[PDB]
UniProtKB/Swiss-Prot annotation, chain B:
Stated role: Attaches the virion to the cell membrane by interacting with host receptor, initiating the infection. The major receptor is host ACE2. When S2/S2' has been cleaved, binding to the receptor triggers direct fusion at the cell membrane. When S2/S2' has not been cleaved, binding to the receptor results in internalization of the virus by endocytosis using host TFRC and GRM2 and leading to fusion of the virion membrane with the host endosomal membrane. Alternatively, may use NRP1/NRP2 and integrin as entry receptors.
Designated name of the protein: Spike protein S1
Encoding gene, per UniProt annotation: S
Assembly notes: Binds to host ACE2. RBD also interacts with the N-linked glycan on 'Asn-90' of ACE2. Cleavage of S generates a polybasic C-terminal sequence on S1 that binds to host Neuropilin-1 (NRP1) and Neuropilin-2 (NRP2) receptors. Interacts with host integrin alpha-5/beta-1 (ITGA5:ITGB1) and with ACE2 in complex with integrin alpha-5/beta-1 (ITGA5:ITGB1). May interact via cytoplasmic c-terminus with M protein. May interact (via N-terminus) with host bilirubin and biliverdin, thereby preventing antibody binding to the SARS-CoV-2 spike NTD via an allosteric mechanism.
Taxonomic superkingdom: Viruses
Full-protein interval shown: 537 to 584 of 1273
Length: 48, 48, 49
């Protein structure tokens, strides 16, 4: 999410057992790195 | 002792004391239920 | 007003200019404190009864 020129990254990792869809559960997202860049990003793509 | 303090842009007057309160690495400051300065972290060293 | 923090306004604006923002903070807190005291006087009448 972009806040007035700042990028904030949330990261969480938990083991699950899943094939398709999503399991029912609850988890908390912990922030990782705040990026004070200020660029506007209108689009994104998968590089992987 | 009770002194005038400025930490991370937060100002006020009160006694500076250490505690065991655990703060996440990205959190530089915290507030109480009254939306006032409660606990801060020093930028140069690691303390609560 | 601009902000609710007093030390934020004092060290920021000018003495003639800050009196305008501080007056907005005072008059706003005068009615809020007067409302609580008025509410206590009404509630105390029910407790006295």
């Amino acid at each position: 999410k972009n806040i007035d020129g700042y990028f904030k990254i949330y990261s969480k990792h938990t083991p699950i057992n899943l094939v398709r869809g999503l399991p029912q559960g609850f988890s908390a997202l912990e922030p990782l790195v705040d990026l004070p860049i200020g660029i506007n990003i209108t689009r994104f793509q998968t590089l992987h | 002792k009770c002194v005038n303090f400025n930490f991370n842009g937060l100002t006020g007057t009160g006694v500076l004391t250490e505690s065991n309160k655990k703060f996440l690495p990205f959190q530089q400051f915290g507030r109480d239920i009254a939306d006032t300065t409660d606990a801060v972290r020093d930028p140069q060293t690691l303390e609560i | 007003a601009i902000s609710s923090v007093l030390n934020d306004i004092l060290s920021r604006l000018d003495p003639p200019e800050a009196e305008v923002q501080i007056d907005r903070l005072i008059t706003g807190r005068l009615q809020s404190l007067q409302t609580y005291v008025t509410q206590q006087l009404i509630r105390a009448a029910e407790i006295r009864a």
